[PDB]
């Protein structure tokens with residue numbers, strides 16, 4: 001599966017047009033397919049590495065686990081009601097929009113932090 | 123009371139010689155008299171204030187409670203075995219040397235962080 | 245030709261453009277043989293999922309959403325020119341790109357002191 | 366911009382829409398899909 | 407190189423360290439992380 | 448001034464804000480914290 | 489082309505073989521395997 005996760009509107013069974021993106025105040029949960037976790041893990045992995053320099057210099061804030069930006073919702077996940085109907089996923093791992101924001105600006109803020117030290121080490 | 127905390131090295135009977143600065147793997151616990159908590163609280167208070175800017179920019183690491191650098195040891199606390207004998211304090215709040223180091227370099231690291239933003243706000 | 249025909253992409257802070265005008269404007273420019281004039285909100289619905297610039301007004305509060313939810317949710321988040329460091333998608337490639345060459349042509353061994361087949365060049 | 370109604374969940378001339386780029390979300394679709402021999406399998 | 411002690415599992419001036427490149431393990435972190443639109447999703 | 452929403456309890460462009468100095472409350476954070484040797488302990 | 493027999497499931501000079509390109513299946517093994525630092529891990 002891929003795309004944002006969808007649950008139906010009226011309730012009961014979900015028939016196309018009965019399914020709308022499960023928008024939440026935080027944002028819409030978009031599914032985190034297996035490979036897309038490889039990236040955000042590979043990105044965070046390269047930051048955790050600099051753990052000994054984050055404590056030394058009192059910056060950072062502990063190791064960044066990718067499991068802090070996701071969730072364990074479940075529903076049908078596709079690109080559109082029609083095709084999302086063929087991807088019933090249970091307790092999949094989705095990252096809400098407002099989260100897709102932090103995992104972003106965190107990896108960005110930390111990326112600066114290390115990008116600097118990482119330059120001296122070099 | 124004031125100064126580093128001491129404890130009866132010879133056990134039980136605490137005389138003006140059976141004492142000894144209770145040092146250890148963390149350094150020496152120095153007592154945190156009432157007023158000296160006013161400062162470190164007044165310093166941390168001025169940093170917590172900038173909470174909304176720490177999250178926004180993914181720096182920081184949560185609010186700094188002064189109760190994270192101290193402890194609740196108990197013994198006699200003075201400047202020297204002789205005079206420390208007249209300050210039996212129970213479950214006083216002491217900050218160990220290695221801690222007196224962080225509460226220091228934290229307030230220092232955070233102080234930079236805010237000193238900058240705090241300049242733009244101005 | 246209609247979307248980029250109003251640069252829906254900035255790279256620092258935000259910047260709006262009251263929708264009425266915008267539309268009533270492209271109602272002009274767009275040449276009579278597009279397909280965005282024959283299906284406005286049939287293209288618009290496709291569009292909303294590609295441009296987190298166009299945020300459709302929610303039906304039951306008749307106001308935007310602050311957040312923009314385009315299908316490329318993540319990808320589009322990781323391309324924004326993050327102010328901390330230029331652009332992850334850029335700086336990342338400019339590196340893997342160089343790494344390719346470094347191993348490829350054989351830049352390594354560039355001043356090797358020993359016979360090398362011209363082919364190696 | 367003539368009203369449609371259901372074909373798609375949003376009207377274009379619909380109530381309170383809003384063009385407004387944010388340096389934060391660079392619009393997007395999927396162009397660089399990898400298909401090269403070794404990488405597609 | 408002043409002794410530290412616990413901050414990190416290794417001292418730099420620590421006992422029996424050893425700089426010694428091996429053609430076998432070419433030192434490398436993670437630079438080429440793929441993020442392009444199609445490939446990140 | 449673009450709407451945020453929860454990050455902080457107040458929006459800047461929020462409804463009915465109000466810049467209005469009062470000779471009564473001279474705005475001030477904490478600059479003169481005492482740390483000198485004798486006074487900090 | 490001398491007959492073999494079992495080494496491999498097909499004889500070359502075998503009965504009814506057939507060279508015949510189809511614009512449909514462009515012959516290709518696996519050259520572009522990704523191994524770059526960031527992408528291999």
Ligand SMILES: *C(=O)CCCCCCCCCCCCC
Pocket residue numbers: 246247267268270271274280281282283284287288291366367377
């Ligand atoms: C009715 O069709 C009047 C014209 C208004 C929209 C036509 C196309 C121009 C705007 C495009 C909207 C969808 C993505 C650009």
Ligand SMILES: *C(=O)CCCCCCCCCCCCC
Pocket residue numbers: 121407408418
């Ligand atoms: C004490 O700091 C004396 C200096 C010895 C090391 C300083 C930095 C030079 C060696 C780098 C070691 C870490 C990776 C290069």
Ligand SMILES: *C(=O)CCCCCCCCCCCCC
Pocket residue numbers: 243448449459
């Ligand atoms: C959106 O950011 C539009 C600009 C309005 C505020 C920007 C900063 C100027 C006002 C400062 C408010 C906070 C304390 C001065």
Ligand SMILES: *C(=O)CCCCCCCCCCCCC
Pocket residue numbers: 489490500
């Ligand atoms: C016996 O070996 C006679 C020669 C016939 C085949 C020899 C090689 C030329 C044909 C190649 C077949 C395998 C892929 C090209």
